[PDB]
Write a protein that binds this DNA or RNA. Sequence first.
RNA 1: UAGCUGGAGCCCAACGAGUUCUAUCAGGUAAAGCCAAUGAUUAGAGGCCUAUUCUCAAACUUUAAAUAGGUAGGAUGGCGCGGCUGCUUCGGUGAGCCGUGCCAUGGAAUCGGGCUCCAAGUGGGCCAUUUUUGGUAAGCAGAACUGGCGAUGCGGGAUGAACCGGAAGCCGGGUUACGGUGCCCAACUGCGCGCUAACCUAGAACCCACAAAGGGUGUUGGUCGAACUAGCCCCGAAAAUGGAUGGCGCUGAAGCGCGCGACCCACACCCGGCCAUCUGGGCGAGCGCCAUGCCCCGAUGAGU
Lengths: 159, 33, 49, 175, 49
Amino acid sequence: PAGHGLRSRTRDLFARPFRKKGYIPLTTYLRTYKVGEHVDVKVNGAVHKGMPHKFYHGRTGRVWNVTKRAIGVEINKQVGNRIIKKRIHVRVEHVQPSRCNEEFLQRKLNNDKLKAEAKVRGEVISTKRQPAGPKPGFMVEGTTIETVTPIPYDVVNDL
Amino acid sequence: AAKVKAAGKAWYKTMISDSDYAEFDNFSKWLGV
Amino acid sequence: AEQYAGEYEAQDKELVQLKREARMKGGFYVSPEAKLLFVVRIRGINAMH
Amino acid sequence: HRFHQYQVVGRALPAPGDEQPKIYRMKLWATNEVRAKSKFWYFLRKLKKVKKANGQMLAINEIFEKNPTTIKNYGIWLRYQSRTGYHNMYKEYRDTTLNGGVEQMYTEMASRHRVRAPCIQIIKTATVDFKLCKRDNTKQFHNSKIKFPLVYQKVRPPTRKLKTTYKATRPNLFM
Amino acid sequence: AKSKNHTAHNQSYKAHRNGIKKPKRQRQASTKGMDPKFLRNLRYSRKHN
RNA sequence: UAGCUGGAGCCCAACGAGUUCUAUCAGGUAAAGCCAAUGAUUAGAGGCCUAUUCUCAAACUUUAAAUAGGUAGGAUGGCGCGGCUGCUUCGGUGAGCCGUGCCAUGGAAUCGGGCUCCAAGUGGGCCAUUUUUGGUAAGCAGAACUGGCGAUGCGGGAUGAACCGGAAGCCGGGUUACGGUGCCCAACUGCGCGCUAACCUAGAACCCACAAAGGGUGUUGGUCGAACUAGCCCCGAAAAUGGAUGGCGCUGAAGCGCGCGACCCACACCCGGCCAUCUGGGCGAGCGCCAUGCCCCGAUGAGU
Ligand SMILES: [K+]
Ligand SMILES: [K+]
Ligand SMILES: [K+]
Ligand SMILES: [K+]
Ligand SMILES: [K+]
Ligand SMILES: [Mg+2]
Ligand SMILES: [Mg+2]
Ligand SMILES: [Mg+2]
Ligand SMILES: [Mg+2]
Ligand SMILES: [Mg+2]
Ligand SMILES: [Mg+2]
Ligand SMILES: [Mg+2]
Ligand SMILES: [Mg+2]
Ligand SMILES: [Mg+2]
Ligand SMILES: [Mg+2]
Ligand SMILES: [Mg+2]
Ligand SMILES: [Mg+2]
Ligand SMILES: [Mg+2]
Ligand SMILES: [Mg+2]
Ligand SMILES: [Mg+2]
Ligand SMILES: [Mg+2]
Ligand SMILES: [Mg+2]
């Protein structure tokens, strides 16, 4: 509407990947989604029902509703001054489960096990991540050292 | 003391070493190869 | 304060011994990377990204 | 001295692929150590494929002149960038230190060719015996009976306290 | 007389004066728009608790 | 009309953030490709075919960046036990919810105090780095991100809305930024190496106030051999009032390229005094006070 149709400038966005057309694998269809889960939205151009608008391609959101052939996904949209939590329904073909919290979910289990040991031994620990920092001092044995020099300029071999 | 001096002289020789410069074939005459 | 003052030494001195011993057996000792910065702003507050 | 010679040693970061990587050394001319390490990482990135983010800095040591009281003949092989193209050239200098020769080289390139320090790459430095010197104006100072007058005296007071706007007579200078 | 047609100049600066407003995180997200089945059933289960 | 702004509040203090990091998604622009599809396109070779080959694409593309985009990084979590459902399943099978007892060292870095009402003005914009469309071009016409001027003084660019520096109460002292130190003009005719000689008005400060193809047995460095290259200089180089490196002038420069030491110099930075704004405090069996007062503390001060 008002100058641009629903699928305008989606010539590359909604096209299928190279040599990856035709049938849709069964894995797409029997993945399980529950309310509160995180999913990435990736439109595929062979399925035209339940197709999300081009804005939500490449965005990750939460599952808030589950129907027979679709799920409700909550996605942030910035509209001027604020963020609007958009709620859309998308068929399962255009959605995949997100791995944006996979490293967090395993780490939470491990932190629970580590703090369990500190309970048994009576110690107090942290189990809190720390960014990569300065390396400690160390020694390297006397070995071969290769000398590096600036190379004389050659006109012919420039191309 | 003598071992101290030998390590310093070995280090100094390494610092002031020069490459062969033999891998620049067509510049060998122009360079001091 | 006495403990800290004597700890600044034996840390500078130990690095002098470690580097000497590395050369003593013919290698390189690598100093520990710096952990602290002092940062001073040298430009003004006009026309900022 | 304006310029110092440093020996910079580094390597690629030890990774499970190698875990004992090769060691690389360079002799670089810079005004201090921070500028010597930056120029080292510049050449390692361009000549090898190791840049500062993937590498480790092992050692940096300043090289010094053995005999700073004698006069040596110093040859320098360099690479410089002009307004149109790249050229390499050989220059010869006479100095008590190779530090002075490198300062002389940078000053001469700035004057005769308007080439700044970034556009210069020192390929090779060495000491040349007076029998093997190639450029003129270096051989003519190899005369053991070298004799000449001072044709420009620069008449001036010694310590700026003796400076006056006026003088009662014209200076007499001779050579 | 012709004039300018469109620009986004100064619009993002305007948007950040009261910097981008994230909606309030609330426990008990609204159930509006959820499928009416399982919504009436949840209502019946709560009534019979 | 929404946005930007003021005023009035009120509610509270873990919550966040124009940033990075760790992890994980998404992309078809740059580049590249044609020895891959679509299209264009030069040439031979061997037998229409085969193997090569030169050159291409905003409305071509297999591959495919950088920069930007989204999500997550616990107390709004988890685990048992027991219930409810009219939903779901062959089925306590599940999906949820309700009750209840336990557990959860606070889960990367850095930084930090943050629901409603009423209303004003505005809705001609312009300029700059980068990207970018039309046009021979334009101080032209139109877009993307950010900053700036408009709304803003102050120091430098001789001068100038926008360039460089830097933003501001009234002052004292110290020091800097940009830019400079022959005089105009505060600060060296400072220390050091070269190059240049202009009988064309030689040359001399980002934007910026222009110069080209091409030449020189001017001079100075290089390279390759028994000509080539690139610095400064000269030719190429023509407009109307008399004229402008800002002027005078300058030639071991007071020009050009590169250094060294000190110095000059903003309303910028530091220390101090005072005025105001804002923040946080103290003062009753009151010898007790314009309590709307007084005292103490810290930061702040541009404005159509
Ligand atoms: K169109
Ligand atoms: K390619
Ligand atoms: K093709
Ligand atoms: K209006
Ligand atoms: K010439
Ligand atoms: Mg319409
Ligand atoms: Mg600025
Ligand atoms: Mg116009
Ligand atoms: Mg308009
Ligand atoms: Mg394309
Ligand atoms: Mg291209
Ligand atoms: Mg209004
Ligand atoms: Mg106006
Ligand atoms: Mg005006
Ligand atoms: Mg002062
Ligand atoms: Mg002078
Ligand atoms: Mg001017
Ligand atoms: Mg020419
Ligand atoms: Mg001037
Ligand atoms: Mg004051
Ligand atoms: Mg004010
Ligand atoms: Mg007013």
